[PDB]
Amino acid sequence: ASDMEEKFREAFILFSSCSDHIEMYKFFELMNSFGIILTNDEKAALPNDINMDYWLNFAKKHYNYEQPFKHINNVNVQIKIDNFLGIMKALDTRLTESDLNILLQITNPENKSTLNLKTVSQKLTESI
Amino acid sequence: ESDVRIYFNEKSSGGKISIDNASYNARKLGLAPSSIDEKKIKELYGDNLTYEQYLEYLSICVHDKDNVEELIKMFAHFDNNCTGYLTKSQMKNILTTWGDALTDQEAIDALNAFSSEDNIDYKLFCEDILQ
Amino acid sequence: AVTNEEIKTASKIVRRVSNVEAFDKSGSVFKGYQIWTDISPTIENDPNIMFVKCVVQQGSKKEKLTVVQIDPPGTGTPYDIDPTHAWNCNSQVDPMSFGDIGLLNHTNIPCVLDFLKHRYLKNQIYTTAVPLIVAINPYKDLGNTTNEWIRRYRDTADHTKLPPHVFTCAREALSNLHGVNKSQTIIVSGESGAGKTEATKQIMRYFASSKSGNMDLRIQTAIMAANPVLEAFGNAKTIRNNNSSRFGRFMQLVISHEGGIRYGSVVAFLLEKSRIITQDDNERSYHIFYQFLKGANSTMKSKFGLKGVTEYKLLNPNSTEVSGVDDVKDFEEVIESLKNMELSESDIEVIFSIVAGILTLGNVRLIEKQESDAAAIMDEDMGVFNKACELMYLDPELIKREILIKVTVAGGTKIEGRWNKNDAEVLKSSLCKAMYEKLFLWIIRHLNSRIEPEGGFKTFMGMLDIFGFEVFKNNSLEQLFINITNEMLQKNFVDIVFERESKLYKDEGISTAELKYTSNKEVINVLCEKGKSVLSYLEDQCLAPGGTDEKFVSSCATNLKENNKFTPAKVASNKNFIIQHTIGPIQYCAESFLLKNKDVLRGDLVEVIKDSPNPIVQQLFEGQVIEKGKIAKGSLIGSQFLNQLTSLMNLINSTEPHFIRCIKPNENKKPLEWCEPKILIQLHALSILEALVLRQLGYSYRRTFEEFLYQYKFVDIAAAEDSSVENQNKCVNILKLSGLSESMYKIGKSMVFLKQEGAKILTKIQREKLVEWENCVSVIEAAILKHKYKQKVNKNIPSLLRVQAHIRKKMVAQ
Ligand SMILES: Nc1ncnc2c1ncn2[C@@H]1O[C@H](COP(=O)(O)OP(=O)(O)OP(O)(O)=S)[C@@H](O)[C@H]1O
């Protein structure tokens, strides 16, 4: 049994700029940062003025305690680097070229031309 | 210097004073110690200080570089439209989340003692506490 | 600060172009969709704000959106706006992560204003809109133009790693000059207080920073020393700027490729002579007068008989002091600078003798003397008059006569009469203004004689520091000349954008037939063309006896019907008229046009001055034509100025231009204060918004074949990774099967050319082919962004510890 409330609370104010309410776009980033994913349906059923307490309940229900980054790699798999970097850029990632190089040194130390997405889900789980 | 030596004798025991009480004096004398300073003097002399170390400790706690410009840095970081203001809740969450976090009651009390208004001029909030 | 006239013209510039896509295919609002709108009580109540950010509420119909304002913070109240009042939003894009406005997904007006604001609020005041550089006055020292920043900008391997900066423009300009043996001009324009003169001084210091020494340091030192001197003589404290430049400045420079100024030449035009005589309230005359009167030592006050700053008719007695300005310290800088331009002490003493005589002549009083109604000098001022002429090395009796004795021609006979008091004061004033202006120009002549290359310039770096388009309600002659100058520069801007683009299409074999050019040839003609132009008729009227301001206007209205660029004004059609400048109609008032245009010392006074024994006063009016009869174009401001402008424009047009467009963000000289209606007005007058539009037209998107393939590989990953197809034919294959119409792309010799709209469609197409990765990319990014945000907090934790430490110290106080 493992309490995440402090981490949820810290993340909320990181994305809301310390306010007790959070904008919808920033809420999507928040829940995505703990590996949470919603269809457009559950998305459109959210409240319109999401506050801290709402987030803490939502996180409790949706956070994958056993596999937080299930959606990066599920244990229920390897991609070329330049393919990966292209896909990131294709999907309009807000990461700078530095952020990506740092992620790549971390996840692919040996500068192999392949990247393990299991590895990425591991290292991210470590930084939580 | 008498203040110093007076406050020591209130809370001295076996000729040494605890780090917690030694910090209490430092506050009483108008100094503002943090956990960093409390840890620097833990490394040196343990948890009980003789008079001379207590003095050396009070030296650590002067922090003359303390000005409004230095203190407001974290509030400024969360002031995106640069208004000079943050809500009470914004500053409550900062004071109770990171650093030598206060309790919620301590933060609320410190903000409600500075203004009855929900938006707070943090340059002025920091200047107030610095005196 | 914000007037109602500002609100009127700022709402005129506002336009809504692209549509807002707030609904999904099924007709529902995208959850949380954000827009900009100009409808809010925040906007009604605060004139610094023109747009606010809202989110469209679930249930909105498509013909009336229901929104709730979220930035600035609001009430949570839903309200209804017409879609023509919603603008698209760039949500989730870092304004600091690139330098050019055109890289934004939407470049509508609220998006452009907001992109520049949040860079400006993080002390990034430089942003490009190719080919334009925008520079916003921070009104505090950001610390980014020091020597260490000069070295960083000059010595960095790839200047592309660095953000936009005036140094980047200096470095490119210098690099192109030595790279292809082409002269360059840096054109710095904008309204008062915008930071033009700070910009050009920062560029000069860059240029003066050699990698390892400058043997011609004596010449460079003279050029740099000219900044304090030109400012002292040509700058004044106005309501808008404590240090306003009251003249246009052009400079040519020779700069070694590793830095270091080797030669130079300075040119000043249209000095505001009228400021020498009178000043508005809370304004001063030229700095030099106050530097000199306050800074001169007791011996110099004795020689020249100087009184106090508050004791001169020509100086406003009530605005003597300017907060933040130490005129005495400035004097010592001017004296040292004069020596650095290689003026002897004798020379400098003559210079300030003349200034002392100008000031003193202003204190001479004239009276009416009736026997007639002649004028005469007040008896108690005859010494004051004599001293002032001795101070200017002028012949006092000869100067007296020209001011008191009028020669007129009637019949064909010369008749000796007398000037009355009013006309004699006009002559005293002319002498004062003429001597100051020519002394200013002599100092520049002297400088140039030390720093110009003996043969003329082979290749040079030009620099131009001028007002942009000026638009008030009351516009006068001074604004007319300014706005003509800027028409000329607009034509240069539109030309270079067209030449460069036309060149690129030709080089790639793309048809140019769809290229665009909005000429302003028709309005330059209406202002300048000999025989049918405003400036022709201003000249004609000034020459002809009995010319009036009103007869000037009248000839214009009857002779300029051919182009709509001239428009008679509705109210007071005598003395008012409108011109269709590139930036909109501008209204001019011809009151005193003839007065100001003929404001040039001519006649026998000039001949007395030329006859002075002193070799410097002799050269003030060297070789000025003798105007024995009538009056000639040679002594009209507009006629001379137009020759200067033409000469200046031929020079610039022969160079590669660089445009620094300066912006003043508020009228309070304060840092971190953003006034949107005033900024928007300037975005329009500086053609910044047009620059975005201009660049987006046609096949604005180009990528070499392997950039296109790296960028768009997954549009058809099959087509892109076919090992048996050359890189060019891989692109044709990808585009043929993408869905794009042929009208939307062309294949060049080496690049893919895309219309802007086709690039966005191609981007959307690649993203649908990658739907499976959308979840995985969202989470990677979001997780990393969280960490990126926690690091920025960790930086300020040492700060936060102190806040909390004093908080607990104060709890002990209880
Ligand atoms: N880049 C800058 N950094 C800091 N302060 C600046 C900067 N640019 C301008 N300022 C301040 O703003 C004042 C006015 O800027 P100027 O460069 O004199 O304006 P200007 O564009 O030359 O306007 P005119 O036509 O001479 S009235 C300066 O004297 C400085 O106080």
Ligand SMILES: COc1ccc(C2(NCc3c[nH]nc3-c3cccs3)CC2)cc1
């Ligand atoms: C009698 O006609 C005039 C016209 C203008 C002036 C002014 N100085 C010119 C100037 C200062 N800064 N920039 C400029 C110019 C920009 C473009 C051309 S000059 C006084 C402002 C004075 C007299």
Ligand SMILES: [Mg+2]
């Ligand atoms: Mg200037």
